[PDB]
Curated annotation (Swiss-Prot), chains A, B:
Name of the molecule in the record: Cytochrome P450 3A4
GO biological process: aflatoxin metabolic process; alkaloid catabolic process; androgen metabolic process; cholesterol metabolic process; estrogen metabolic process; lipid hydroxylation; lipid metabolic process; long-chain fatty acid biosynthetic process
Family: Belongs to the cytochrome P450 family.
Annotated effect of mutating P414S: In allele CYP3A4*19
EC code: 1.14.14.1, 1.14.14.56, 1.14.14.73, 1.14.14.55
Pfam annotation, one family: p450
Organism in which the protein naturally occurs: Homo sapiens
Gene that this polypeptide is encoded by: CYP3A4
Other facts noted in the record for this chain: Chimeric transcripts, characterized by CYP3A43 exon 1 joined at canonical splice sites to distinct sets of CYP3A4 exons, have been detected. All are possibly produced by trans-splicing. The chimeric transcripts exist in 3 different combinations: CYP3A43 exon 1 joined in frame to CYP3A4 exons 2-13, CYP3A43 exon 1 joined in frame to CYP3A4 exons 4-13 and CYP3A43 exon 1 joined in frame to CYP3A4 exon 7-13. The longest chimeric isoform (CYP3A43 exon 1 joined to CYP3A4 exons 2-13) exhibits 6-beta-hydroxylase activity, while a shorter isoform (CYP3A43 exon 1 joined to CYP3A4 exons 4-13) does not.
Induction (record text): By drugs, such as rifampicin.
Binding residue positions for heme: C389
GO cellular component, one term: endoplasmic reticulum membrane
Length: 443, 443
């Protein structure tokens, strides 16, 4: 299989037997994508073990894959690995099963359901503030991912299950047992030995820990709006499949939001003029520290620009991927069946062809003047098409609500322990090498 | 997975952990199907390892599976196992790849191409006769599968590749290395360890021997009408995929025809009145030992009845199977995705509900009077629907041509070594326990 791109005339790094190009992931696959783009141009191919992967960067071709030919050709992501019952999670499911799950779970994220959650998640924005004042009087720098993770977990639990637990002063199975998720050498052996995935499945081995899953399974059992929207009810949902969607939302609510929130606060700390301008917008829109509402959040243009520019620099998804279901010929190029088509979001977000000074944090990229010159298929922090991020609206609103409440009360500065410039971890996930610590001063 | 049929309300034999019901194959799976039909009625379910299999016997439901819902639900047979490049063989391919192969190879078996082969395969019918006279003068009984296999291999090679080799006096890679195909304990371990199939594939392990495949690969290479119909040319064929179809046809030409021919000659030997009546029809239609033609073969009604009644007693395919592609509800019954739907041809052919005295060889079942009372979905020796036997017309013509030439010259009788009644082998394939030996006397 390692002669595919050579026969297609498609350039790429020469693969090694068995391993493919996975050894070039020593720099992390975000640096691999950037170097491959620089060296091979618009399109290139490489191998994850034996799996051929075709990387595309042309906006026309990206839109054809993500949007135009989603249902007919590019329906599914690359198979997850040994999952067990998590095969029914929406982000893992394939074909008509995903179509049903996407249709059944879409009502959860409507702007009507979104407006209902804002009074619920503003109560934790005040607990988050009080928790911040505790360490603000301490005088020593704060670890943001701890307090933001507690906030994000509190928000996702109550909005999903209606359970209200202050995480910082306590909460274990969730959060404390949701974090885990290591960069094991097991995942590397999965791509080198993908033929072993059916072995681990029959041994009831899964990447998820069996004790937390059975906790949620029995947690939702004694639980007898997202939890309501599935219960009150294509085809009706199942009990064990009920739990699968909860794990995704919990992980997406906790891990994603709190990681991006820490990146934003880092950028605000290292750019005080941006922090001051954002604080001035918040005080103008919400005079006298008025509580943020659904409609006031949507009125803050500079807040939207700061969130967007941070998601440009740190697209936590790093890559978009779709499995080619059949032989196709897109935009003048032929894709054989079984090839994983990959869009390197991280490299595209930092490409000098579309971004001026791409490494610099400049929110004015997303101003109403310059936003029209931004291609929606180069800048894809939430993906695109029918399989984009279903919680995009919730994530943006959840992050902005936390940012407003936090900046109304505090200003953030670098401390002696702050890593400047921030160094990204090379172990897969888009996270800082050192945890982000910042000085917090009450306004 | 072993609780599926219990939750469906579908009866069946209680499966063992890991193994399923495969231990009940000690009697051979043809006896297993007959006993299950007798015990559980119209429908039942069992497990090949972890694989659930649903057996159906209602003619309405069979027609829905084989004919009505072939392209939408029941397109593919159960996956073959470790195949290697033989995954592109038409009888193994799935979905649109099978559709292309079925469309590209259908012109091989037209009645026009069939009429062209009759003058070609009549030359071996005369070599077969001369070979038979040699052992007829010997005076000792003859092993039919040897002389019929040589004939069938000669016919399939010349009709497929245009190569003309007298097999009996010689031919090795083909035939002598085509037979092999043992009832290994490896196939049993395949169903118990179906998760290991991707392991054997990556180790370049296949059920087919690697030396014969590369012989045909290089045989057809120096070969630079079936071989012509693919070369002279949906999507064009491939070199390594060229060889895959040749292996199927060679195996189907050799193994299938010669096994059924031996069953027919056994029945003729143990029913002299049937043999005499058939000989009288052949002498009436072809006076003075006239060579059989395409049109004279189709005129022999009693010849057709004898072939059909033998295929009722010995349907060498034993089972028809289709993988359920999606959740469906057929004829008032719900089939979940991934269940193998199986039609037990052997048991249906010997069911007292449709056949009087089912164990008895009675060609008058298929007379023009009684043939109308035969359901085409109970009697399915060549399958049915778009995925039936593509070589049905060729096989029937090839067998009848051999039978005519053989019975014009010889009469067949049991000898002291003849096994009466014939005992079927319990090791999977529908073949006699003892090889069929018969006394051959020149007319
Ligand atoms: C800053 C926060 C987030 C970012 C940047 C983000 C980004 C993404 C991206 C890029 C995808 C893949 C899109 C594609 O393949 O085209 C995705 C998928 C998904 N996200 Fe998010 N996401 C975020 C937060 C969330 C949240 C808070 C939730 C739920 C509470 C969520 C639920 C999902 C689901 C269910 C999918 C899979 C959808 C499907 O396969 O149909 N995400 N996300
Ligand atoms: C007495 C002789 C034969 C019998 C009883 C027989 C029976 C069958 C049956 C029952 C099937 C499966 C049908 C289904 O699944 O519905 C089949 C498939 C097939 N047979 Fe035969 N067959 C015979 C001879 C031959 C010959 C001589 C050839 C070629 C030279 C051949 C080529 C094929 C092929 C290619 C398939 C698979 C077709 C597909 O999957 O589309 N068969 N046969």
């Amino acid at each position: 299989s390692h002669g595919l791109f050579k026969k297609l005339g498609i350039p790429g790094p020469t693969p090694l037997p068995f391993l493919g190009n996975i050894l070039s992931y020593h720099k992390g696959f975000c640096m691999f994508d950037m170097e491959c783009h620089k060296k091979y141009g618009k399109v290139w191919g490489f191998y994850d073990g034996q799996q051929p992967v075709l990387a595309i960067t042309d906006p026309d071709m990206i839109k054809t894959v993500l949007v135009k030919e989603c249902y007919s050709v590019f329906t599914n992501r690359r198979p997850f690995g040994p999952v067990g019952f998590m095969k029914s999670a929406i982000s893992i499911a394939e074909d008509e099963e995903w179509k049903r799950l996407r249709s059944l779970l879409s009502p959860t994220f409507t702007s009507g359901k979104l407006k209902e959650m804002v009074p619920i998640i503003a109560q934790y924005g005040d607990v988050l503030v009080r928790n911040l004042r505790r360490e603000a009087e301490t005088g020593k720098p704060v670890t943001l991912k701890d307090v933001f993770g507690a906030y994000s977990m509190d928000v996702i639990t109550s909005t999903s299950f209606g359970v209200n637990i202050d995480s910082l002063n306590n909460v274990e199975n969730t959060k404390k047992l949701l974090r885990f998720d290591f960069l094991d050498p097991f995942f590397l052996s999965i791509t080198v030995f993908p033929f072993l995935i059916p072995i681990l499945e029959v041994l009831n081995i899964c990447v998820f820990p069996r004790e937390v899953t059975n906790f949620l399974r029995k947690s939702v059992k004694r639980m007898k709006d997202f939890l309501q929207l599935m219960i009150d009810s294509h085809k009706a949902l199942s009990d064990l499949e009920l739990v699968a969607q909860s794990i995704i939302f919990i992980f997406a609510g906790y891990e994603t939001t709190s990681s991006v929130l820490s990146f934003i606060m880092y950028e605000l700390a290292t750019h005080p003029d941006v922090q001051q301008k954002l604080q001035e917008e918040i005080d103008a829109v919400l005079p006298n520290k008025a509580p943020p509402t659904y409609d006031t959040v949507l009125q803050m243009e500079y807040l939207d620009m700061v969130v967007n520019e941070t998601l440009r620099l740190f697209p936590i998804a790093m890559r978009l991927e779709r499995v080619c279901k059949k032989d196709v010929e897109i935009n003048g190029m032929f894709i054989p069946k079984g090839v994983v088509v990959m869009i390197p979001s991280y490299a595209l977000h930092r490409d000098p062809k579309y971004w001026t000074e791409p490494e610099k944090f400049l929110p004015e990229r997303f101003s109403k003047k310059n936003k029209d010159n931004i291609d929606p298929y180069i800048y894809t922090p939430f993906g695109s098409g029918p399989r984009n991020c279903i919680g995009m609206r919730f994530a943006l609103m959840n992050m902005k609500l936390a940012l407003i409440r936090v900046l109304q009360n505090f200003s953030f500065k670098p401390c002696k322990e702050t890593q400047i410039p921030l160094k990204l971890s090379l172990g897969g996930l888009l996270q800082p090498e050192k945890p982000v610590v910042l000085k917090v001063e009450s306004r």
